[PDB]
Amino acid sequence: MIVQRVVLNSRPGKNGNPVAENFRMEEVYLPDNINEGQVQVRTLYLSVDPYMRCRMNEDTITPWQLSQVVDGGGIGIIEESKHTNLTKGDFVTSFYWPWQTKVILDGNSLEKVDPQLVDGHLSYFLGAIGMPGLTSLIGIQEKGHITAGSNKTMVVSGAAGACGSVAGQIGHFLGCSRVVGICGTHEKCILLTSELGFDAAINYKKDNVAEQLRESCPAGVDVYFDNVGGNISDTVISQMNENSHIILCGQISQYNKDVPYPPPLSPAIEAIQKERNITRERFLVLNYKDKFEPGILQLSQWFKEGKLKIKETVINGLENMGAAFQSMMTGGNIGKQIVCIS
Ligand SMILES: NC(=O)c1ccc[n+]([C@@H]2O[C@H](COP(=O)([O-])OP(=O)(O)OC[C@H]3O[C@@H](n4cnc5c(N)ncnc54)[C@H](OP(=O)(O)O)[C@@H]3O)[C@@H](O)[C@H]2O)c1
Numbered sequence: 050m051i052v053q054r055v056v057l058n059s060r061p062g063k064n065g066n067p068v069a070e071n072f073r074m075e076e077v078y079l080p081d082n083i084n085e086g087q088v089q090v091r092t093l094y095l096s097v098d099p100y101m102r103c104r105m106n107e108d109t110i111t112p113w114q115l116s117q118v119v120d121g122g123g124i125g126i127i128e129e130s131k132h133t134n135l136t137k138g139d140f141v142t143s144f145y146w147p148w149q150t151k152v153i154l155d156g157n158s159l160e161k162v163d164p165q166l167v168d169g170h171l172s173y174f175l176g177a178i179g180m181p182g183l184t185s186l187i188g189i190q191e192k193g194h195i196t197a198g199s200n201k202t203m204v205v206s207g208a209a210g211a212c213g214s215v216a217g218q219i220g221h222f223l224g225c226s227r228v229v230g231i232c233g234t235h236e237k238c239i240l241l242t243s244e245l246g247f248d249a250a251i252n253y254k255k256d257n258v259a260e261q262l263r264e265s266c267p268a269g270v271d272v273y274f275d276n277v278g279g280n281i282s283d284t285v286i287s288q289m290n291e292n293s294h295i296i297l298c299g300q301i302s303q304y305n306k307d308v309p310y311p312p313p314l315s316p317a318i319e320a321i322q323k324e325r326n327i328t329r330e331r332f333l334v335l336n337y338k339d340k341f342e343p344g345i346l347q348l349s350q351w352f353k354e355g356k357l358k359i360k361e362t363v364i365n366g367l368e369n370m371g372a373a374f375q376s377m378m379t380g381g382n383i384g385k386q387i388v389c390i391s
Pocket residue numbers: 098099100180181184207208209210211212213231232233234237276277281297298299300301302303332333334335377378379380381382384385386
């Protein structure tokens with residue numbers, strides 16, 4: 050059998066912008082034999098995620114290698130098994146799925162998923178009922194310091210993306226009385242306020258952010274779910290209250306620069322931080338793998354109850370992996386960027 054796969058073609062440079070050309074699609078034969086403890090899976094969906102930007106650089110786990118197959122989050126279906134708890138027809142996922150239409154994997158690296166949790170919408174396991182959703186829920190639970198009925202105001206940057214779109218709804222579910230998002234287009238702002246329940250949405254590219262935050266957050270900001278960093282965050286931090294908390298989820302505005310992570314705050318912003326006693330600690334969802342079960346069950350519950358709205362942008366075809374990554378990195382996605390493989 051002949052399958053398609055995607056390999057890393059070129060590096061954009063630690064200070065470069067990633068582009069679709071950094072990837073190349075090829076055709077290869079799929080081995081006709083599977084060893085023991087190994088399974089053959091048909092790839093259904095693949096995720097593209099901002100952390101991948103660092104895997105394209107020569108340094109920072111392992112980076113992708115030129116000419117070798119790329120990998121990342123994926124969901125598929127078992128076609129042939131030689132591993133105990135894995136059977137033809139089982140739906141599985143892995144953080145290291147090769148960007149290839151069909152692949153042979155060691156069952157040990159796979160994890161069975163229950164279609165019932167997502168009402169059969171398997172791509173949701175790569176988003177809101179998956180890692181980004183877990184990141185938002187656990188991040189707010191572990192670093193948000195909210196309380197049922199606090200009347201707190203939360204600001205969310207990267208508000209219309211995978212983590213941000215879920216974080217804002219979760220802020221309201223857990224007690225925030227006001228949730229304001231910051232995103233890059235008016236189309237996203239209207240989606241946030243009209244469908245996801247945000248109280249206000251600011252377009253950082255065209256609106257006066259500072260002024261708009263003053264209007265929409267009349268009582269300051271108690272919680273900042275930060276996905277972008279940079280100048281947007283400085284503006285947000287400026288309007289934050291005493292003893293507030295920044296959930297440091299990501300700093301995507303810095304991912305195409307040669308800087309340390311987490312980026313440090315500018316002198317004046319850091320002074321404000323410390324003076325107001327604002328907490329800003331590193332947060333890595335992988336450090337809470339024991340809350341993954343209850344997180345996923347809670348996220349599923351809220352979705353089944355009609356409370357949690359799940360937005361995704363699906364692109365079709367493996368040949369489009371590089372275009373999807375490039376698109377997500379530049380704001381073309383609303384909600385979770387997904388690639389449908391078959
Ligand atoms: N701490 C953890 O364990 C953890 C886990 C998963 C993800 N993350 C982090 O969370 C963030 C969001 O991840 P995601 O998967 O949900 O991706 P996403 O938000 O769905 O997609 C990226 C979005 O970032 C925005 N963006 C790109 N460049 C930007 C810039 N220079 N300035 C401002 N906004 C920019 C774009 O939308 P706009 O149109 O609004 O600009 C884009 O759609 C990333 O920073 C990621 O590294 C952290």
